[PDB]
Design a protein around this ligand. Structure first.
Ligand SMILES: *[C@@H]1O[C@H](CO)[C@@H](O[C@@H]2O[C@H](CO)[C@@H](O[C@@H]3O[C@H](CO)[C@@H](O)[C@H](O)[C@@H]3O)[C@H](O)[C@H]2NC(C)=O)[C@H](O)[C@H]1NC(C)=O
Ligand SMILES: *[C@@H]1O[C@H](CO)[C@@H](O[C@@H]2O[C@H](CO)[C@@H](O[C@@H]3O[C@H](CO)[C@@H](O)[C@H](O)[C@@H]3O)[C@H](O)[C@H]2NC(C)=O)[C@H](O)[C@H]1NC(C)=O
Ligand SMILES: *[C@@H]1O[C@H](CO)[C@@H](O[C@@H]2O[C@H](CO)[C@@H](O)[C@H](O)[C@H]2NC(C)=O)[C@H](O)[C@H]1NC(C)=O
Ligand SMILES: *[C@@H]1O[C@H](CO)[C@@H](O[C@@H]2O[C@H](CO)[C@@H](O)[C@H](O)[C@H]2NC(C)=O)[C@H](O)[C@H]1NC(C)=O
Ligand SMILES: *[C@@H]1O[C@H](CO)[C@@H](O)[C@H](O)[C@H]1NC(C)=O
Lengths: 374, 374, 374, 374
């Protein structure tokens, strides 16, 4: 017995595929090994996404894995809900419940607002980018209306990097004359690097400037640049380099080669690859459970076409979904347990503060409890 | 001749289809005819939208008319840009550049900001509905940062229709706490109607307050239940009922046998229906210019499917776009001229106020010239 | 042993006839049965009233139930007092003392004056209607002269359904001129509803005002519109929904259907229909008491003619009157007991306020004890 | 040329019947005669009024003359407007439009308010009775709210005679609370006489106190009982004993004995009798106009009864209305012209002021022209 799945990846994501492959070989059960059919593409292009989805569907697949973007999420969820097909993804959670989706990335509004309240903040600048949804923006606006914060929201994605050098100085002079020292960067890792580059270029990271990063990849980017800048820099992390699971994994990982396993001859891993590992873990766990419950959801014939009207659902997929969301596992990202919808719950996020010696875990946040300090 | 096209109407757009039929019968002639294949659907279901698009593309149409929403726009844009088939629509404009799309609804951010500057506001509230987009919210936030305002933003989209009575009351109570007299509603017609009902109920339409309907359909809502409260009320209009063309159209529209043409026996008309009328007009003019240019625009049953891998378009489509964006004509919305990206230009927006003796066009706004008073 | 009676109802009073039947079946048989002959008619047309009265007196009835108006009351009073035929009615009591008339409606003047003294008013407005008499107006004017008040009286009855909005708006504007915030409506359900709609339209139900509905139908009106405006709204009630008999009756009453029992599938009930039910109870009790006293009230022959000269009144009629003015029971309206003139006594009027949570009683008013607080 | 009519008179009306006979004489056209069937009754008893009406309608009458009060007017209006039967009366007009009713008495609100203004009044009192309608009271309160008056209204018709000494005493003492020196008396003849008697008893008839008689007969009561005292006293006069016609009539009125013509040997005549005279005159004139228009209105004791179901009128009746509301003569009351409703149009009232010498005509009030000076 062997289950066939479909994988969707962007054009330029080597480390995530490396993690997927190493997880496949590690967790490979001689009882049943998985056969993934891979499709690389431009995740933003919804046409290519739909073409790939239809191709995987015509191949008779029970579950799909891959990333989605802001311009490719609604079609994904709609297809999954209409065909009752399972889509696993470490990408940003959806702006609301969406059945038949497995979110391996935890929310961030909670821990972020907790950190804010903890540092006793009342005024700051939220520099955001429309890449992972705008739920955090709406969340902070609501919490500002609640606690009466004088927050200033500013988008940066529409600004061309070419012309985004003079407007930068303009807005920074505005912040200086307004004394907007506190900032929150809800942007992508690459954009975060670009912005810290511009900052080091202007040197506006003097004492008082308390920078916060609204992402889980704190140690992923470059922080040795602002290490000794005397600037309050904070962030979150989801993978703990302290536990033994992560330690043995990173051993076996950095002990690899960048020839057949790109982006794997180092230590600093990206939370995306860790969530891919955990997703392979949960997938094999759910398939083992389905095989042990005496349930054979194996389709006799091909699932057929996607655009074929009317919709052609099937209950074995509903059982698959109920199986994925009936799981409780450990991985590089900590504890893993989903609710009835598909989100991830019972998790912990390690808060980190940048210092001269380097980053230090200054506490942890969870859902049952608020932010904790150690 | 006889040229066929498609229509992607929602389930609940009757006035729009009525105006579509009206334009079809009026602008029609013997030079050729327009054959629309219509589809009434759930416009948020990206799966259904994709099915309808692929269908109308298999039939070999030359263009498409219809609608979309935040949960269906990227699919349409990518499909049209990959297949080079055009797509006309009165729905909200795309937050960016997108080819093979003709957007009939002009932008609103500019006129809104000009009006706010005219009234010289510094601290106010903004009630938005996530279900329609947030570009305007982001624009106003940027302008506030650049102008030191106090914008209290609030989402009213997640509010179901089962208990949306105490929610608004608590909301406006909280606003009264913050001493919020000035408000801006960026919502559809039904939502603004409900909000106004609750305002009246809590008696918040009296002198001292202000309201601004961030929509081109000012006189389309039941603006009479508040015309006598005593509160400032401003808004925007795109159809000028004091023009010759609008009156000559109403002469035939108010006598249309509503049973036959739903939502027709009246003198009011939603701006979506007017933009649909203008859309029929512009596509007719474009195909007429094209047929009168000595170009072979013959297309046979050689399209087939939409998921063709590789996906090859037909190069004649690019011509239609070049001809659909080279139209400079007048209609219910006023002047109509498009740019290279499909957005509208050289347009006018009548800034209206509400007085006890009815609304009155206090001024006009444009993109080349800022707000103008009279 | 079926006892014949008559009934006079307007054209539009169906809830009242429904309650009449409910009562006829509740007290159906103690030692006998009843038999009503109904007549619907324009009650303000004294000609039809006279025709009905004469037709019923010809059928040899022992009593009569029905309504009247300001312009159909002297006819009833005279005919009854000359022919010795009782007349039970919930309509407005007479502007004086008249025999052979049982007025089931209590007087509202005393409680209204006590309430006005309680709120300590000195200058206010009184909106009256030429519908049920001006006795209240005369009483309040006299008490004003005796207490140095400033009453602004306005008639709102002699206006058609063609300029209502203009009339009410101009009226309340004239009020605003005098800075009048305290108002008293002596109108009925329809008029108060219209006035409330209009005052909401102009926004005068907000904090800083005070209204008093001078009718026992406080809850019977639609107050849900102004429950949240923030303005005082006082009123009177005669049926305590929080009682035992009222609760059992409303349980038995809301279960019925609007097909056989119009206006009998709700939780509320107008004081007119409640008084109708109580009147059925009164008539039953009186005739049963007569049967207990062993009185053969049978006619020796036919009643005769309604206009016979010399008009001869059958003596037994007098005794009937006594049995109607001697009974004391407990019903919806409360302690039902009459005096030697037909009026009501030992009654209780529950004063009510409209708080945001809903109409919550504050006290009660009696004839021996003035307004009580609670 | 022999017409039978009906007359309704109170039990105690002498001057009115005397004038009726004198008029039937002075207009006994040799062409045709008017045979009256007279009925003396208690006009405050709707039963007797209706019985008499039916008796006269049975004997085949074409027109009916008589009086009524606030307790018998709606009966008359309904019976007439239903059976299409004319009813002439000098009694108080009807508040509204009631067809088939000739109202020879002019209204009084106009001249009354015009006088109030001509004397520059701002605050005063108004003692009325409930026996002739509250129209004047309502008009006064309306024009007060419109002209910012401080008016103290009182009802003095609900009190007996023995309890007047104390009641009137306390009433006047309270009236002096606001130091009232200007009062209006909209009462009957006996009422005003008792009022002025109690006044002189209390001694408040001295200068400073201004009284007004709100009626047309400011010559009949004790014009001299309170004359001496220099106290401002005013009044109205519909008749003018100086005119030639009135003098030629009074010359015979006085000479005429009292036995066969009770209440006749005098020089002053209660306005009711003058209007009775004018009524006979106009009825003769109308029947003459009809007999001249070559019209047959043959009617007799065949029309049937009053309570017939369904009450059917007869066409030839309506014409008589057009024959009474479309005539014009010059009698005691002056120019007589009616409208489509039945009331007068172009009457000329005279004003009178009392001095130690006697009454003196001040000016005259009309409908088109307001008060006038001589
Ligand atoms: C940057 O990081 C340093 C790390 O220690 C922060 O230092 C201490 O942090 C607290 C809170 O994070 C600061 O204080 C608060 O103190 C003010 C009084 O100044 C009080 O009103 C507030 O209620 C709150 O308790 C404190 O000033 C700061 N420094 C010291 C010497 O304790 C620092 O706050 C972080 N932010 C910046 C802008 O440096
Ligand atoms: C509703 O609209 C009326 C329009 O009359 C607004 O009255 C407006 O009143 C304000 C008062 O602050 C005026 O502002 C002023 O101009 C004078 C003279 O330059 C200046 O000295 C003041 O400091 C203030 O800036 C405003 O001009 C006037 N409207 C217009 C069109 O001129 C009323 O405020 C509006 N209601 C609300 C709630 O906004
Ligand atoms: C409305 O109701 C409030 C609360 O009952 C009234 O406020 C009272 O008004 C009197 C004046 O008559 C004040 O002395 C009191 O302090 C007020 N509060 C209380 C708790 O008694 C108010 O007057 C009423 N009328 C209006 C127009 O608001
Ligand atoms: C009573 O009548 C007299 C004259 O007949 C009125 O008198 C003068 O009238 C002018 C007109 O406004 C007033 O300004 C004077 O005050 C009047 N003089 C006096 C001595 O009163 C008078 O106004 C009338 N009213 C009263 C109450 O006497
Ligand atoms: C805008 O449109 C109007 C109407 O067609 C036209 O007259 C005007 O020239 C246009 N503006 C420009 C800049 O072309």
């Amino acid at each position: 017995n062997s289950i066939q799945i479909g994988g969707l990846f962007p054009r330029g994501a080597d480390q995530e595929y490396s993690a997927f492959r190493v997880g496949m070989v590690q967790f490979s059960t001689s009882e049943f090994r998985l056969t993934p059919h891979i499709d690389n593409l431009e995740v933003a292009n919804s046409f290519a996404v739909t073409n790939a989805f239809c191709s995987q569907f015509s191949r008779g697949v029970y579950a799909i894995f891959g990333f989605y973007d802001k311009k490719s999420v609604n079609t994904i969820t709609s297809f999954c809900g209409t065909l009752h097909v399972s889509f696993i993804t470490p990408s940003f959670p959806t702006d609301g419940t969406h059945p038949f989706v497995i979110q391996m990335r935890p929310d961030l509004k909670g821990a972020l607002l907790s950190l804010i309240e903890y540092y006793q903040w009342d005024k700051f600048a939220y520099l955001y980018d429309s890449d992972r949804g705008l739920s955090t923006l709406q969340a902070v606006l609501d919490s500002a209306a609640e606690k009466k914060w004088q927050v200033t929201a500013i988008n940066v994605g529409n600004i061309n990097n070419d012309k985004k050098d003079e407007t930068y100085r303009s807005l920074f002079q505005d912040l200086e004359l307004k004394k907007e020292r506190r900032v929150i960067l809800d942007c992508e890792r690459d954009k975060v690097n670009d912005i810290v580059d511009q900052v080091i270029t202007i040197g506006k990271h003097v004492k008082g400037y308390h920078y916060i990063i609204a992402n889980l990849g704190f140690t992923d980017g470059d922080l040795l640049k602002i290490q000794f800048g005397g600037a309050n820099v904070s962030g979150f992390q989801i993978v703990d380099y302290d536990d033994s699971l992560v330690s043995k994994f990173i051993e076996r990982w950095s002990t690899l080669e960048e020839k057949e396993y790109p982006g794997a001859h180092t230590a600093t891993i990206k939370y995306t690859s860790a969530l891919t590992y955990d997703a392979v873990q949960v997938m094999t766990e759910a398939f083992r459970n389905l095989r042990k419950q005496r349930i054979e959801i194996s389709r006799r014939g091909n699932a057929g076409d996607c655009l074929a009207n009317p919709a052609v659902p099937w209950g074995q997929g509903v059982e698959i979904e109920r199986a994925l969301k009936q799981v409780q596992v450990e991985g590089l990202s900590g504890n893993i347990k989903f609710d009835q919808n598909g989100k991830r719950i019972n998790y912990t996020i390690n808060i980190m503060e940048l210092k001269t010696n380097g980053p230090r875990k200054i506490g942890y946040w969870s859902e049952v409890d608020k932010m904790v300090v150690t």
